[PDB]
Design a protein around this ligand. Sequence first.
Ligand SMILES: OC[C@H]1O[C@@H](O)[C@H](O)[C@@H](O)[C@@H]1O
Ligand SMILES: OC[C@H]1O[C@@H](O)[C@H](O)[C@@H](O)[C@@H]1O
Ligand SMILES: [Ca+2]
Ligand SMILES: [Ca+2]
Lengths: 742, 739
Amino acid sequence: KMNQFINALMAKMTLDEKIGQLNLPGAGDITTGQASSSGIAQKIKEGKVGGLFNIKSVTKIKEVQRIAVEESRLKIPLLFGMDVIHGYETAFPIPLGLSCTWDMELIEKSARIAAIEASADGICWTFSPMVDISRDPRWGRVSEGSGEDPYLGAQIAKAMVKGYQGKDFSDNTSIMACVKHFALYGAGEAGRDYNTVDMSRVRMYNEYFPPYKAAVDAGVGSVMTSFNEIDGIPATGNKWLMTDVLRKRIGAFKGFVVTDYTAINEMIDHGMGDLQTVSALALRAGVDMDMVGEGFLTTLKKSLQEGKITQAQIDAACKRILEAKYKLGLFSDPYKYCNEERARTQIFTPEHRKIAREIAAQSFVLLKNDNNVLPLKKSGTIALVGPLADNRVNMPGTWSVAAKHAESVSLLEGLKKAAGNDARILYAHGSNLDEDKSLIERATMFGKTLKYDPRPKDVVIKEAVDIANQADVIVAALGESAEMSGEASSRSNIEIPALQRELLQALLKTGKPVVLVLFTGRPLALTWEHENVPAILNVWFAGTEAGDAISDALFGVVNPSGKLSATFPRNVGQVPIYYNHKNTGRPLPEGQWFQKFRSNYLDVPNDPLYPFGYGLSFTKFTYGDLKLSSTNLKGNQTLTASIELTNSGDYDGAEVVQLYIRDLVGSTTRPVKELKGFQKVFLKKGETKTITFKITPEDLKFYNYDLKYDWEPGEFVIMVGGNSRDLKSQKINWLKDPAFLY
Amino acid sequence: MKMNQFINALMAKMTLDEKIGQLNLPGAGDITTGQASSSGIAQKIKEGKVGGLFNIKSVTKIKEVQRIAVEESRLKIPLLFGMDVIHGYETAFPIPLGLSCTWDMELIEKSARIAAIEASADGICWTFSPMVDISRDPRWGRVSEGSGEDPYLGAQIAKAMVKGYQGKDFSDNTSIMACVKHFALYGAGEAGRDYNTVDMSRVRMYNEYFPPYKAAVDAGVGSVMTSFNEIDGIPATGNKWLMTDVLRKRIGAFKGFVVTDYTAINEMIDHGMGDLQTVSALALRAGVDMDMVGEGFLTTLKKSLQEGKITQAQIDAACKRILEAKYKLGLFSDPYKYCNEERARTQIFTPEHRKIAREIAAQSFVLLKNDNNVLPLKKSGTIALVGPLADNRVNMPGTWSVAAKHAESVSLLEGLKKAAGNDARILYAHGSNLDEDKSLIERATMFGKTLKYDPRPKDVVIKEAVDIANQADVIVAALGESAEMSGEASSRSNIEIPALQRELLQALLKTGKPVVLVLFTGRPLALTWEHENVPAILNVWFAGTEAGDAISDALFGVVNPSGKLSATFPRNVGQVPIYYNHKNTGRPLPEGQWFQKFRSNYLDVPNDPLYPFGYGLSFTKFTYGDLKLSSTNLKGNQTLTASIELTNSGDYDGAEVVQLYIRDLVGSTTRPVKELKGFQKVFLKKGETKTITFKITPEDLKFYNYDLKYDWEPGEFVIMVGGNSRDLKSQKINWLKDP
Ligand SMILES: OC[C@H]1O[C@@H](O)[C@H](O)[C@@H](O)[C@@H]1O
Ligand SMILES: OC[C@H]1O[C@@H](O)[C@H](O)[C@@H](O)[C@@H]1O
Ligand SMILES: [Ca+2]
Ligand SMILES: [Ca+2]
């Protein structure tokens, strides 16, 4: 069995060969046809390479793996990793957009399909999911995550891990997952990427940690450290974090820890010392694999000779890496993931694209729909206008490194396809992405270019207005470019670019009904748009099928059913503003802004523009009164909470029913509410269904001042609705059972 | 009969109810002169239910109220009389944030001395001051009451403030008991919204936020006020770790009493902590001694005692602490110590006091830009003064000036005309209201701090000012905030000059005439566009009753501006929180290299603030030589002497604030890129050179490490000296421990 086989392996290994297993270097370019004489080859031959990443194609990966199998002393195969974030070649929506589906079945599926494509191409390990909680729309990496809520985040994290890893690591359709970035990366100060993070231990445990824990408990194979410091120690060298929290219950994690890109080396910049010092710190902390920086490879032996680390520390890190490869099936078949036929037939198939088209349409959030503007009639003339109206490579959004960007369906493309002979579609650019070309340049890196019009904005705006005047309705494709979010894409301004707002205004001024189809990787400040635009559909970035999926929604093929996973502020002045907040000692009563001497601003209401969980539909949903099985409970009983949901509008549709719980009094202050459950239900027009939730004390537990995980006896409010804001509710009392106090 | 014996003897005579009554600091209700003894508050005092009262004004009223306790209560225990004396009593000095920019501890202390003198002369023996909350968030209206973002400068000002109020003896009739607030961390409210949640690590508290409070305590501050915010999920007012284990940690004993903020106990109910009895008991157990307004102590402590939820010892200890403050202030030898009509007649708002305020105000201004020798203005030709803040008295003292003679302040128009005389013609024009949106103007001008409002269309009023401006040789635009746009519960999600005023400024610039922006504000503002387009910018904060004269002294060059920012001025609110003493991060952006993908930086704004901590210009120029160090290799408890030649290389006499920064390069935890560790304000005649010297020891190197241990670690440091936290001369050293 595994344990005997790996001890046997390690018994044959030299110190340098163990150290080598901990190395995850950059590959450098590898000339197809002479991989065995390439730069990386020599290091593989000497047993200095544990794995590689962002190598693409089974053909290339196969020949690189051959070097390790045929030309290294012990023939230890490599891991091959990659950033498979929201799909391999078929792009699903960016993670933040996927979160708004609130559909854990759909989400697990997208991961499943992504792992089927990657594994068919020699990839056996993905750097996903990223489950960083964040309350800061300025941070470009909000797009990679799933919002501000620990519960929803935890559910999604589970779905993602289950999707990738499947039923068994050794399946050639399952890949190993890597939860990132441990930890607290989403609280970087001032929303500036990589910036200082600081918070209390109790906040960590209640507000930020749960998603990481769900990934571990779901059996995630690996964990990736984060770039930020915590309590003044970078995550990568933080022993409390990587050892005391991550591996507390011994048998709990069991996987291995990889650093983020040169995160060890960067501890030098942080102010922790030289490369040897920070490398040793990382190993003692519980880090097992060193990404790109080679601090482990170059300094571990010296540190050992110097007594700064121990043999057992090296052996334990090496063991974990081998155990990963063993689980993935690599020792019984180093080429398990290398089949030319799978790669030809199981990637970017018509079936896969179709599923992505279906999923994408379920992620859209309908933020406004006045006067039945949507769905559009498929008749007359429709004017599509804006810098995002006819572009392919931006549709998949950021973190789509293996995506077929150029085969993506543009919005103009999908609209003409949908309209057919029944409606005429007119196009106009309207305006560039921004007035500042240098901003455009840096916002469109990595080949994600937008066609640029050199003419004066007024000329181009007038052009679009003339076209629009010839149409009956106007569809405005505005927002961000794909690379305005993602890594190192922080924005101090979270509005739609000014130039585009000037365009939008000129369109509204035509008197034509306007639909704002919004492309973004983050929450945006949209008060003015909400005030003036008849309809607003948030499409995030929908993937390779964006144009088709969006057209499904626009014409009413699919009834929008998405709901916000993060709060949209009125202005960046409100940040951070989130749903699960404390009451403060001077709360502003609802509807009373402005009140002197309450907690509020002089110049903006306390409320965000759209709250967590917000999402409209083409139809309407009516909630009956909240039914509770009991208002007086004791010990480990089960509370049943039920409610009637009725489709009272004009169309078939789905709605997300949300359960919130409030702990009224506590030994510490409790959030005014916390998401604790949800169910997505489809209803025929006029149909009524009884939705039921089962609450137990487990749902009432929190981390107290002493970090004890428990619930306290007292009153609670149980809330249910399609919003963190609009809810039916009922108070209950829950007591302890003296007999069972252990 | 020393204090301890007397207090013990007294408490032996008191009923439980009388001990509890000493813990009560209620709101007074209206009190009709000539019938105080039959007024609303009178019955409570007679029953012994009142330990103190606050915000009552005038020695006449206070003597009479004190007479109720002295003559009509069973034990004749006199009352404390407190007030918010924040930046002056009737004579108003600049707001504290403004004052902090003087970087002149003597002036800070003197301003507090004059305040104590005035307040004590009018019956006040206790001020709710200094406010020493560290803040990195300019949205927070209360930044105006503090001293900026730096623990060191903050700690220095705290000492200066406490000494100024308290003197060397609590029993002097010119000294009043100070009260450090708001313990603690109040300045980190989320999203800059007053009273909002606070959260942070212990190590950040100790290094970045706690030092000013500790300084006040070590300076001997007589009392401490709790804060409205929670910490680790527990409101400060009910937080035993904070109020006992930190505040009264054995060594460094705080010996004074703790008073809650305004109904802070009752608000713990809203926080989510329980009912009034529960939260009251929590507060007493935490170490709270006096209960402001909410009467939780008064109405619930006995019941808790009966139920064994609190102890007699806890009540006794609190009562004793209150009685000790009264004793120290001399109230048991003379209950009317602070009640002398003649003092109040001769020692308040005197011509001398007003002169001192004028001098101190002028030294608090920060010159943020001065291109092409626009300032100082020549006292000739014609000068146009335009803006919503050009001719208004009541706003000049700014916020937190409840006792100030607002209506007697010197408006900028007034002060200018006076200094001009027959040498220069001052023209005036309104230009614009404070803001479009009247309803915002209204909530921003509460408490009787009203501005003249012009019903005419904005374009009309602008054309009026432009036509006046076009007749002058220079325009002086008085723009910015109103007084109550900052202060308590005055948070702004937008920290620019109000748009209407900027549209006015644009119009004034377009005349082609040189424009000087005289900026009124209680907070750092985002001023990028203004910095790019306005020739000269003078930040005058809120200068107090003498605003007009002090500002004219600067404009004409009577006084050469010498202030330095104590808080960072961001490029936009999207950069917040942005501060000088920050960590390096693992991916720092090299200086001058914005923008770099995969470095710690924004797509749409540079990393740099607009004006950094310690920034401030002069009418003259200062040149620093090279930094001279006595040694670059130190061992144990040696003294390092750092010296530098400073030269007044400009055209005017003037002072500059020489600043000392230190960087600990490597730590067991990450260390800030720099921390202020010393400063000196020095005056230099035109062309004069002086050797400025600092003396550094390991105490200057210490910090709280991961385990909260206060100590220094051996290794390399950078020593930096300059007039600014960004423009520095530096030299690296090695400091080792010894066996
Ligand atoms: O590409 C490997 C890693 O690069 C890092 O810069 C990112 O922060 C990670 O999310 C990514 O997985
Ligand atoms: O007026 C008494 C107290 O009122 C409170 O609302 C403020 O926060 C304190 O600074 C002030 O001293
Ligand atoms: Ca409870
Ligand atoms: Ca050091």
